[PDB]
Amino acid sequence: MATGDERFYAEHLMPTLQGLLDPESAHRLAVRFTSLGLLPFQDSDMLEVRVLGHKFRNPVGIAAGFDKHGEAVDGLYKMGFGFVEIGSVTPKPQEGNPRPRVFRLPEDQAVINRYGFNSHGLSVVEHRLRARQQKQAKLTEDGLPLGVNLGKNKTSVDAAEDYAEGVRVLGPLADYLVVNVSSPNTAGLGKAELRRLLTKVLQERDGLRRVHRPAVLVKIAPDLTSQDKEDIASVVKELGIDGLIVTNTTVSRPAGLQGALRSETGGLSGKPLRDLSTQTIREMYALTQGRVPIIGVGGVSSGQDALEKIRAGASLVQLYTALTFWGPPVVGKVKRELEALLKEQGFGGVTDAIGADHRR
Numbered sequence: 001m002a003t004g005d006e007r008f009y010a011e012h013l014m015p016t017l018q019g020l021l022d023p024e025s026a027h028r029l030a031v032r033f034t035s036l037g038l039l040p041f042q043d044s045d046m047l048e049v050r051v052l053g054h055k056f057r058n059p060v061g062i063a064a065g066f067d068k069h070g071e072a073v074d075g076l077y078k079m080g081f082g083f084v085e086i087g088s089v090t091p092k093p094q095e096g097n098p099r100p101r102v103f104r105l106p107e108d109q110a111v112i113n114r115y116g117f118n119s120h121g122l123s124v125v126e127h128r129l130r131a132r133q134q135k136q137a138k139l140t141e142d143g144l145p146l147g148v149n150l151g152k153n154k155t156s157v158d159a160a161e162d163y164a165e166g167v168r169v170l171g172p173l174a175d176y177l178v179v180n181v182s183s184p185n186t187a188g189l190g191k192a193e194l195r196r197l198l199t200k201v202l203q204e205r206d207g208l209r210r211v212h213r214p215a216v217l218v219k220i221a222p223d224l225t226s227q228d229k230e231d232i233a234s235v236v237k238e239l240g241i242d243g244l245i246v247t248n249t250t251v252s253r254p255a256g257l258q259g260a261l262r263s264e265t266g267g268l269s270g271k272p273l274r275d276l277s278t279q280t281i282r283e284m285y286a287l288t289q290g291r292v293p294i295i296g297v298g299g300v301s302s303g304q305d306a307l308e309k310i311r312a313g314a315s316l317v318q319l320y321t322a323l324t325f326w327g328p329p330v331v332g333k334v335k336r337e338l339e340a341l342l343k344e345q346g347f348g349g350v351t352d353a354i355g356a357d358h359r360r
């Protein structure tokens with residue numbers, strides 16, 4: 001509760017919280033507590049990584065979705081994350097799908113959600129980030145970068161314009177932007193469309209002043225065909241996209257799911273998604289010749305999970321669902337185990353392990 005013991009949180013606190021509140025209420029309370037610093041490991045130089053034009057104290061970040069409106073950024077750094085990504089944020093505010101829209105699958109250490117981009121909107125997030133803009137400038141310079149994930153409104157008629165608007169409004173406040181076109185919960189959120197979309201996004205980005213010019217990454221699904229991945233890699237290299245976030249939640253339902261809510265509509269996250277994501281990272285790393293930075297996401301809950309994605313090609317990793325089951329202590333746990341594994345496997349540091357599986 002205030003100490004920081006992994007067993008207490010995993011075995012007592014978290015289980016009790018879930019027994020008292022529904023999943024969405026639990027998340028909202030989580031955001032409140034985090035934003036208030038109500039939280040329970042020292043990063044070694046081994047965990048430091050330099051990519052996307054920035055230094056990262058450690059390669060473990062909080063995935064988009066936990067802090068959709070940028071309300072708990074500072075609390076998240078306090079929790080131990082090497083970098084924070086907020087969003088997705090839509091141009092105009094919107095409520096998202098009706099409740100219930102998030103479901104726990106305890107037996108699978110997984111979650112299914114269909115929020116549908118509930119967002120305070122660009123304007124509100126912009127002011128919220130501006131209020132701590134200088135503080136973030138010092139955090140970034142200190143190895144704690146900030147990412148902003150962009151989405152689009154449900155009733156938007158010009159997808160590309162929605163993202164362009166996001167680039168113009170929040171781009172100046174972020175170290176990196178994410179073009180999220182892999183959410184399974186928005187209408188119909190492709191080589192042709194992607195090229196057109198990203199060309200416009202990059203042009204908008206290049207039009208920003210130097211110190212306010214963020215890297216641009218594309219977040220993709222784990223349900224892509226081989227052709228889709230092949231085309232994405234081609235477009236990425238063609239336009240000079242700075243990086244990829246692999247992956248978002250899956251619309252598939254892997255055989256073996258035990259949770260009673262396994263058939264709810266939405267994207268599945270957690271352990272059942274882990275390896276499908278790692279494999280997607282492996283494939284994208286190869287298709288891009290290891291020249292395009294990858295942020296690996298999907299079922300990371302331990303040092304081994306993180307290292308597998310790093311060895312597969314990820315320069316950084318993110319987690320979300322593991323936090324909902326184990327609580328804040330999982331962050332230090334993952335970092336401590338990653339450090340130990342790097343040593344055991346002969347890597348001088350995280351950097352040396354990036355893509356290691358491909359050079360064996």
Ligand SMILES: Cc1cc2nc3c(=O)[nH]c(=O)nc-3n(C[C@H](O)[C@H](O)[C@H](O)COP(=O)(O)O)c2cc1C
Pocket residue numbers: 063064065066068087088102111113115117149180219247248249269270271273297298299300318319320321322
């Ligand atoms: C409740 C919930 C909400 C999410 N919202 C977003 C979002 O707004 N934008 C986004 O790009 N990803 C979103 N995600 C996906 C996560 O960022 C991540 O890609 C995915 O959950 C896999 O990681 P995990 O297995 O560690 O949770 C969300 C996930 C969950 C569980």
Ligand SMILES: O=C(O)C1=C(C(=O)Nc2ccc(-c3cccc(OC(F)(F)F)c3)cc2F)CCC1
Pocket residue numbers: 001002013017023024026027029030031033034038039040066102103104111323324325327328
């Ligand atoms: O985060 C979520 O989106 C979801 C769930 C969840 O339980 N999330 C939580 C809850 C408390 C969390 C925290 C945060 C900060 C501190 C915590 O310890 C406390 F309560 F003692 F102060 C616990 C973190 C989460 F990610 C349930 C499924 C969806």
Ligand SMILES: O=C(O)c1cc(=O)[nH]c(=O)[nH]1
Pocket residue numbers: 065088113114115116117118180182183184185248249267
């Ligand atoms: O907001 C949602 O419903 C959502 C968006 C996204 O990108 N991924 C996800 O799992 N849910």
